[model samples]
Target: PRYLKGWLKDVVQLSLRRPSFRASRQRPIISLNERILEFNKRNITAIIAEYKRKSPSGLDVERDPIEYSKFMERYAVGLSILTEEKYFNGSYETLRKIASSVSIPILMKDFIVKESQIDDAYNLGADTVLLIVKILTERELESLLEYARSYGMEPLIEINDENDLDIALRIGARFIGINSRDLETLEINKENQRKLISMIPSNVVKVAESGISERNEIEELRKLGVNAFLIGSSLMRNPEKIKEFIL
Candidate 1:
């Protein structure tokens, strides 16, 4: 308990630290080419809808896990489900239930700080995983992505600043997410999303997460070259919007 307890506490302090990239400079281990255009070709933005039983803020965003994944097939480009038990009120069981059941690509959204977590994602049938920049070091990022690739997993490498973006590009990441929420402060910053969009290379698939709850906001974000979106909170409250927006 001593070693494990200490590690867990340390991870939280690192994760609390707040902190997009696309370039075709090298052959990427994961292919975002198809995933980016998956729903876009149908004349809708590529929506990566999320499912969480609840959040750390003590808000429950309940949706029928397996049913929603199947429902998202027609409406969303992909599905991203939370699996952080303590903070997210989610579990890998939910990911397992939906991964095989859903035809579209599925992302296991978790704060991955270890190698075993990567295996957990693959063994559970996640085709992609969310790797956050805030909690990991650059070398850690490389190792994680490489290990994930070894198991046939692609990653949605998320960035908060140009430095984070630089490392992702150096790794030849094809798909990346720019989060509007600050990890250190845990506040939404739409301005952060706006400034970082221009830094991403045209070839890399650009995704924006958080602070995107309105059609107008999404439309405006698209103008900034966000090729895909990973949305959770608002959609959690209005499940029906899945159908309304995807078309």
Candidate 2:
């Protein structure tokens, strides 16, 4: 069944108006070295480590939350914590704890449709936020990015393909995340990232999201000029192998 187009929009609007969603006045710029910076230096294999428990697609990713902080510090990840749900396994507070314990930058990977979420991200010590281009209009995207800039939170625009990349560029987004997953059905497509790589201008940093596991795939993506890679399921399922594959 197809999800209603307005469903996510309504959720976004409701999430923004919550009184608990307070804005942060502190403006701190993230100087952490991201994969994009490495990509600018012709290094395409930067890891964006994720700390997740479960997802709508599947359930129970791992119960070892205690080891997360230790892994984060050891890996020297580009960004950490893709906080999808506030009430679930790992909340923003958990992210704050991890941020306080580590020096790497953190990307608050949530469906950002409101200014309040951006404020919430900063208050919780997030260095960057993910904005899906498919979820918002170009105007909405620009507005959110500008609002984020005021608080010095770096905006990472996530897109599925070329058209989405065009919208991201029009809004002047510096950090671009090319998600290989199809949002409509939540299916993975490696080619989607591969196909869109050349379309991105040389100046823009390209980060690949979803379906990245093998060393060869990472090498292949690097050969294609991709700078950063976001791995969630792969790392979560095989925590023992994360350091070998990611670092």
Candidate 3:
């Protein structure tokens, strides 16, 4: 079973039903870009701590989403909540609860293909959404990025290679993430991330995603101009270690 394909198929199949929730846009949109860049300006590592219950690799850490998120916000600039239900065991209800509990930016992390999911992310109190290039067509990427923006939510466009990097930049992505883990093969290459990170222009916020664990690695990547680090599995396993990543 391929990693991305398994998750993508599951989500795409689930997308057909189109889950419904009452549209509630009472809170003002929090700017993830502003928070990330603002932290970088002060020379701090903008860690986006994720509330991931499980991974394709069989990693799981059962924790209360609201309390865990509230704790992470003390050190992290933003929070990523995995809303994909099947493989990740995440839910919009979890996001909704954490959103109400925390003040920092909350990123709605899921395999997004449909516009309704973006709508749900906004209504469920998400300030940002994740759009991966590998799973989306160019047209879908454009429309989804535009669709998410319409709701005043920042889209963190994730890219793996050169072609998608071009697509991400061409679409005028304000926040571009270089994920080292190839979703299809489930391989993590640090060099690949470094090369891609170096290519991103300074104007766009560069986020180093996946395969990052230690503080020294973050310190080294910082020299290459990475504004944010999206650390999940390691932090979830050892919550106390988050202190090492923070300045």
Candidate 4:
């Protein structure tokens, strides 16, 4: 957590402190893949609902973890809670507090670059941890994934392009998210998502992340075997579209 640059050092230190800061109670993670497959029988993939105070791109707004938990319990299949304070304006305390009232598996979404970040996610009652391939070396990616599994929490392996996707398949994550936003640039290229999905083997639970704002986008990915959509801003605005993607 030391010797990092920019907002990263701040983020990592925030995560490092969490491992020792919270109460020692940890609950078993509800399996994300198992739940998605179960709901797939009903022609429903999964909507990984997200919660944030404000996005990095200036989508500032109010959020309630408790209410959003109930919202997901009613409308979506899973939860992805943001805990980064500087960039994402998330509160890990909020994630911890809401964990008890919800039944769906929770994916702790953050930079997740350190091993302690994974541990903290578990300690905070998360079922999964978001790991981005672009942000981590192959060694770090594999190590974090291994560490996360040791706690019975899977890594939501995130990739943005073909190279990252190849890396993901070799190590293998329970849920693979093909993110359209480039981490360095934050540019949204939905076309990159379409290009990569066809290459993902069907056995891996493929998830489309970002820019999935419409039913048509989900439908397009569906033909290529995408089973889950990890959506945020759009879903937060029009939760009514929750059922819209269920095909």
What's the TM-score of each model vs. the native?
0.84, 0.85, 0.95, 0.90
Which residue pairs show collisions in model 3? none
Model 2 per-residue lDDT tens digits across residues 1-247? 1123644555455455544444443435554434358444653347777778876557467655547656755664455575656322556667666666666677877777777788778888788888889878788899999998887666788889788888898889877888888866778888767889768887777778887778778778877877777787777788665666654
**Candidate 4 Cα deviation (angstroms), residue 215:** 1.5
lDDT of 1: 0.73
lDDT of 3 by residue, 111-223 (tens): 88888888898899999899998888888899999999998877999999999899898888989889999886788999988999988888898888997779999999999
What's the count of clashing pairs in each model shown?
2, 0, 0, 0
Write down the RMSD of all candidates, one decimal each.
Answer: 7.2, 3.4, 2.3, 2.6
Question: Which stretches of model 4 miss by more than 4 angstroms?
Answer: 1-20
- The most accurate candidate by TM-score is 3
Candidates by TM-score, descending order = 3, 4, 2, 1
The models' CA-based lDDT, in order, is: 0.73, 0.71, 0.86, 0.79
Order of quality (lDDT): 3, 4, 1, 2
Best by lDDT: 3
| Model 3 regions lying over 4 Å from their true place | 1-7
